[PDB]
Amino acid sequence: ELGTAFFQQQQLPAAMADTFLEHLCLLDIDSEPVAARSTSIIATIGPASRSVERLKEMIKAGMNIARLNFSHGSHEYHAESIANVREAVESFAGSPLSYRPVAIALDTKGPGPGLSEQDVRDLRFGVEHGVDIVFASFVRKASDVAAVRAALGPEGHGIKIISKIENHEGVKRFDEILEVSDGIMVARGDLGIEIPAEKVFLAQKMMIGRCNLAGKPVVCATQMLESMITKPRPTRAETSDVANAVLDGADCIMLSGETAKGNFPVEAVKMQHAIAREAEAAVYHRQLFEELRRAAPLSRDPTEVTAIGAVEAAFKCCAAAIIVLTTTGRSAQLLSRYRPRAAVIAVTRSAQAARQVHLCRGVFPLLYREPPEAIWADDVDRRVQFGIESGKLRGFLRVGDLVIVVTGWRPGSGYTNIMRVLSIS
Amino acid sequence: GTAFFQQQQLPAAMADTFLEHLCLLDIDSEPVAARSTSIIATIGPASRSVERLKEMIKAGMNIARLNFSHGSHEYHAESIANVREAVESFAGSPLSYRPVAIALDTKGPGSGPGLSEQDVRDLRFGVEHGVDIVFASFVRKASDVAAVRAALGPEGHGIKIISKIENHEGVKRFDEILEVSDGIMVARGDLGIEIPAEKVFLAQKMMIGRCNLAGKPVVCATQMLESMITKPRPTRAETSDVANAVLDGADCIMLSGETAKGNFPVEAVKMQHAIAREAEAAVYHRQLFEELRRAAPLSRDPTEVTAIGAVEAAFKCCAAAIIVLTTTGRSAQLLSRYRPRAAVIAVTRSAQAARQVHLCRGVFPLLYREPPEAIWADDVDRRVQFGIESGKLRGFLRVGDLVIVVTGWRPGSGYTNIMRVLSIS
Amino acid sequence: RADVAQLTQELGTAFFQQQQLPAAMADTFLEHLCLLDIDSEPVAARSTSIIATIGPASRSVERLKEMIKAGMNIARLNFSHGSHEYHAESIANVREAVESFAGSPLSYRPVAIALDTKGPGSGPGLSEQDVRDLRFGVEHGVDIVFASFVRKASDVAAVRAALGPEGHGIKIISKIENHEGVKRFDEILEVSDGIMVARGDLGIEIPAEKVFLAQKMMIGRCNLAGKPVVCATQMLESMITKPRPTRAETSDVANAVLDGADCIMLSGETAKGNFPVEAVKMQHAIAREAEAAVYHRQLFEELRRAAPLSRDPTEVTAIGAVEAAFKCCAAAIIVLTTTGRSAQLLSRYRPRAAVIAVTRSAQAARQVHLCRGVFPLLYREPPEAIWADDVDRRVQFGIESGKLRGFLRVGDLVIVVTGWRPGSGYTNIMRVLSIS
Amino acid sequence: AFFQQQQLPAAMADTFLEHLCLLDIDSEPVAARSTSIIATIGPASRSVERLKEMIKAGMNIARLNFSHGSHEYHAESIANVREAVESFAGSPLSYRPVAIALDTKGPGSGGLSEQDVRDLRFGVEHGVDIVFASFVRKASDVAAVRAALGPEGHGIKIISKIENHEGVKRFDEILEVSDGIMVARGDLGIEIPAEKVFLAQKMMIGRCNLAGKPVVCATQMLESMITKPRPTRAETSDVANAVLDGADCIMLSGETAKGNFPVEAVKMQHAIAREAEAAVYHRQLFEELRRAAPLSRDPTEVTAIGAVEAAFKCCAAAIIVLTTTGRSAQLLSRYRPRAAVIAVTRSAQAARQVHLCRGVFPLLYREPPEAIWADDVDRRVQFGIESGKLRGFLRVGDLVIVVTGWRPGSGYTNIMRVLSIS
């Protein structure tokens, strides 16, 4: 039905192993990755990556989120960077195969006691320029997140707040920070100066584990491919660090000086893409899913119940994809928390939700712009078929494949409750 | 509430080891779920009265066994008529009507090598009288099952064949027998004379384990409550044997002389019902589900994929039931093989499938009698509502409960592919 | 296959086909069940002790000799019936039958004597008849007391007090027979030497359909605590009048052993029944089959995980010795013990290897029958001048008795457990020895 | 306080996810650093005074890279290492043995090259402990190295360096005939795609752990420290992850051979390794290693598993083992006990070589002998206890597991004892 060649690719012999030791022993350098790269790449925009032509190459290389570092540069400089990112992204709207949403993240300068005056003005600039995400620098407690949230004025409540943990207090007050944040960034640069350098891996692994448990996005950042600022190829420790951040459970990986000021920005993005695909296939899904299942509390929320049912169904048939209809991105995020091997194709009419779901591992957003059908069930079926035809065009799906389809019983967000098993025709 | 997590051995269910599970079993933790292991009662002089059969149905009898080792065809035709009269006396209330299967247990080959001439005549009688199941005595090899199947003819294709394993050869050729049978009976009476008595528990536990792995019904039979032929209460070894057969994984438990000729036929049924409910709550679902999940092969069949997704969803929300629409019983059987704690409420129009699904643990058949609605989606919804109304009347469901609803995309058998999370209103 | 490949070449494929070894090496409990084989014959000596109630059908010296040969390890005297004179004669007849085999020390089988009390009746605590019966037990040197209707910790303190200063060595097994005993189980087990699941009264005091829950819970808690647990009443009931038991009865005996019972019991089946010797033989045959079907892989992992961390060297040595025995499929673990405690701590980890306990205490040799898999050897030789030589002679006595009983063969590996100094409480050494 | 240190809350966790969630930057390491550090000797680390600081910083094995330098250059490096090591021999209870490893130039465009035959002969003549054989592609390459060592170099350990696709594909046959493996990531990262090296590293470490044979992770672990005083975030992560993967040894090349901060690079690997060792999830690791090790009738194998099980049961501070060749200590090390394996030996070479096995702390016994063999055994066990107390491994009240044999000579380990300190 599938063949022996299918079960040799994407580390499938290591995936079927009964123990983690046997899983390690079965990892094969000849077993090629087949799935689309699921860990998003965040690239910092700067002099080396600001031009429209350079940004087109970075989008082609795999950049999903553009980071604007407000520690340097004026509002005029950042507005031009945003315009250049949007021009490069929209240059592909002519091809359904190549077009892809790209999120814009504003990384704040940081705090002084409460929110700094500059952070109030920069956060206001972010709302006025329609940024998708804020990477809030030096978050130490829950009230720091509340201050950032308050500064997103009356118009920016939909912006995602990713709290950067950069010091001892942020690590010790992690639970209260995660509770009020949309996600976390393990900001290793400052963390490695604030706490002993030999302890950063403990903070990284703990925070990734807690974010995976909570079902909230976690970003691993700083010096991942540092030597690539001046060299065309990274060190053995750098490729290892990127692979290990993905294996740890990071939803996103980041590039700072490598893309902002370095001599090889496109090559750094290509390297993170290549390593992430290899590491995602080496994830031990058998124990990971069992542990996420056991640790996740019992739930009476139908979206959560449908998500675990759909992920279980996808593993049973080695589904190529889980197609989900989502307005806010929440139904796709709840599928992503169970770490399915199947790609989560999220069909949405919200351009902002399509950009923001790049924060969740394995979510592939498809922005739907057709006019709504008069009969709701027909409009649902057209979106499901749009996800199928996009998957066929992009290589995720072929005729005869099985896909899992996740929908709700009525229009509007919060009603996901249906899982279907569909044969691709 | 806290009261919910104290009942049905839920503290023992959440235990991390089987030792801790045993240590947490509580005699004060009352069973809440409906009794899932079916009871087979042998019909005889003590249970032929139509009025006594009505009491046995109320006590919990699901399958009526006709032992063709004794009595003429005229005697068995009267037993069938009496069973049907008692069963159909409750048809006036469709929301509470309980289907009861009729099983024909053959005399056997005796000294011969294959199908006896009396068995050919008895099997023909079974087809002519519309029996649901055949318990084929002394099955020693796959060709014995083929001979029974051939003697049933073209009109008996829908009859389930349960092979009785009663000797050393049947145990040694178990795998080839199970492959061609619908299920197995561990016929301990003859097995305990054919092999050393001290080895029967090994054959019983092995056969139940292999049937559970194959997802095929297994019956534990003979002397389970033997002393109740003459005494009002059973021995400590008898209650232990019934509880251990359920814990082993038996889909059905049986009564022979206890209901056929004894003085306490209704009390013997009530005793098996009471013990089975206690033992089902003491099942260690945590390890059992994990092992059944791991041992079940990967599948591209949408019914199989939907079934595991629905069982996983039911465990996530502590669903009171999985309501499934089924024509042949197959969709309910595939749910049952994963041993959900949630009751599998199977709604069917087939009177025969409603009787036959009693062979699968935890399947509660509801016979739907209404003619099809003009709109197929409304006909589906009406059957789901019938499952809910029957469930509320019978005590399976209450307002506020969560239920998993399993349906298909088109009419006819073989198209189950949808799982839905529904709140009971 | 790789985890058992070199051992399969050395010991042979026939070795790994016996005693349910394919089911023992299974990775899941489901696969373990699927691999159980009626053609896989038991090889190990029967480890679950049999308690037989003495009465008119089993009182004669000649009948008792046949019951000892059939497998009786503990003789129960039911003080609910019979006078002190009747029970003293039963004790004398048991001792005469047991000592008729003392002429061959390498094969002599110790047999314990247990006194089962009448109980409190309608009273709240220790009855006056129980005080007199317990005093009789001490005067007649009984090894164990099965205390009827224990409902709380103070009931076992009262039994202990009635035994007096001369009965400090007697083991107290509390009988749980009602709802209160089940609910106060933890406090009762804490002060008792062990427990008896007394299913007769328990099945009348609580709903009959709940007894299996109480049995499985109490056996699990006793296994966790490392204290003996007895399953009792109606196990082979039909054998009181019939030569063969029912299918439910053989299943009940097998399931009590699989549950984790250290001992199984016969009441009317041996006391007044027509087939006392056959009932003992039946429990022996079923127990050997069920012991081989135990899923040691998960059982040992769970007993290790659940057992608390310990700084007691006897406890630490015991787990190391059981781990070593599993690693090499050891035929036996030979242990030197004064009180039986070192053998009990090995037994709590449920090794497949027989625990051959060499002791000079005749009472400890009888009492260790309460612990599953402990085979007591009574050493009669006087102490050597050099203590290290005396230790070695006792280990050699265990090996020679083991060879002359079928437990050991040349080429087998045995684990030897000893201590660093004389006296009880100093076990701290584990040795791997090849049998020559 | 005991259960708050060395990541003990994360150690008691029921799942790997919960283990990760419980890792605490405030939980300080207490155990001695288990993973050995291999430092490459060169112009930056050749002086006797510099070597004394590197030994104090944690260097356990000195690597001589025969790709550069003459035989005269390497003989002087060996003499300087031995002078620095023996400068601490005046205090036998704290003396740290240091192994000398010869890393070959390799076959180049050719089997065994003529330069490798001469270099291996030099190694035997100068008493090297280990050979890191470059570019091992098959079992016959190991046999050729073994033959070039001759009858005098029978005791030298051969660690095969896997540096290309063929070495990875023929890994099982190479490991079978080798004493251990080195994941030589420099050449491996050029021979196979750079993004696949982590797969080869994790697979080889897993297979070596399964076989109970030493595995070394090597190259660019702290690369930036060649010119900078502090490493990058990816470098500290790489060192920690090599230890978590299961590497027995970690290595420094240019960082110690030619860099500006050789002592600081050793101190950094020591600091990270201690943190990572405490974060190892022993609950699942021991269970998997125990399940996967085959059933055995060898008494040393049977005693080792019993001793490791006993150590976990009582939270033993150490397992003291008497060993002639190092084999009894290696069999204890394969189960990854949290308890330090204190190996007391009379063989100076075995004391140096056991640094290849994680958690083996070699003590070179140089005390006068005893007339009664049993008394000589007791004296070696007391020397292990006294050295353990002096070094901080043991305190009064601690429990230790003692592993010995029934007769003199190698191959007779069969006894395990539980001893209370003082």
Ligand SMILES: O=S(=O)(NCc1ccc(S(=O)(=O)c2ccc(O)c(O)c2)cc1)c1cc(O)c(O)cc1-c1ccc(O)c(O)c1
């Ligand atoms: O390791 S065990 O052997 N059996 C553990 C065990 C039992 C039951 C389950 S199950 O999840 O419900 C399950 C049932 C049927 C399946 O098809 C199936 O896939 C799963 C799973 C595991 C054990 C461990 C202990 O710690 C102990 O005190 C007692 C026992 C014990 C020993 C022998 C027995 O036969 C027995 O009844 C109990």
Ligand SMILES: O=S(=O)(NCc1ccc(S(=O)(=O)c2ccc(O)c(O)c2)cc1)c1cc(O)c(O)cc1-c1ccc(O)c(O)c1
């Ligand atoms: O028992 S272990 O500890 N491994 C633990 C282990 C690692 C990974 C998984 S995961 O399913 O991918 C998983 C990932 C993230 C989760 O959130 C998650 O829920 C699950 C699962 C388990 C061990 C066992 C071995 O046999 C061995 O050779 C090596 C190791 C090893 C290796 C790495 C370590 O960090 C370490 O401490 C030890």
Ligand SMILES: O=P(O)(O)OC[C@H]1O[C@](O)(COP(=O)(O)O)[C@@H](O)[C@@H]1O
């Ligand atoms: O993930 P979200 O934001 O809850 O959106 C899921 C929603 O999408 C749907 O599938 C389709 O809804 P719309 O037709 O309003 O887009 C709903 O049935 C469901 O509630």
Ligand SMILES: O=P(O)(O)OC[C@H]1O[C@](O)(COP(=O)(O)O)[C@@H](O)[C@@H]1O
């Ligand atoms: O379990 P079976 O026999 O495959 O029946 C399941 C079938 O029942 C249905 O849910 C309802 O079908 P009908 O309307 O024909 O009764 C189908 O969609 C599905 O294929």
Ligand SMILES: O=P(O)(O)OC[C@H]1O[C@](O)(COP(=O)(O)O)[C@@H](O)[C@@H]1O
């Ligand atoms: O099991 P117990 O009662 O603790 O007895 C174990 C004792 O037996 C011995 O092995 C031998 O002691 P004895 O010489 O007193 O018989 C002691 O070293 C050890 O302390």
Ligand SMILES: O=P(O)(O)OC[C@H]1O[C@](O)(COP(=O)(O)O)[C@@H](O)[C@@H]1O
């Ligand atoms: O680990 P190895 O090389 O087998 O050495 C272990 C040996 O050391 C001893 O403990 C002591 O032996 P020596 O007295 O010869 O040093 C032996 O009993 C044992 O066989």
Ligand SMILES: O=C([O-])C(=O)[O-]
């Ligand atoms: O701000 C950051 O990204 C950091 O400190 O790593």
Ligand SMILES: O=C([O-])C(=O)[O-]
């Ligand atoms: O035929 C039967 O039912 C038996 O033998 O048990």
Ligand SMILES: O=C([O-])C(=O)[O-]
């Ligand atoms: O007293 C007893 O032994 C009983 O009730 O089982």
Ligand SMILES: O=C([O-])C(=O)[O-]
């Ligand atoms: O030879 C080496 O050490 C390498 O290539 O890493």
Ligand SMILES: [K+]
């Ligand atoms: K910033």
Ligand SMILES: [K+]
């Ligand atoms: K029949």
Ligand SMILES: [K+]
């Ligand atoms: K009594």
Ligand SMILES: [K+]
């Ligand atoms: K070299």
Ligand SMILES: [Mg+2]
């Ligand atoms: Mg920062």
Ligand SMILES: [Mg+2]
């Ligand atoms: Mg029969």
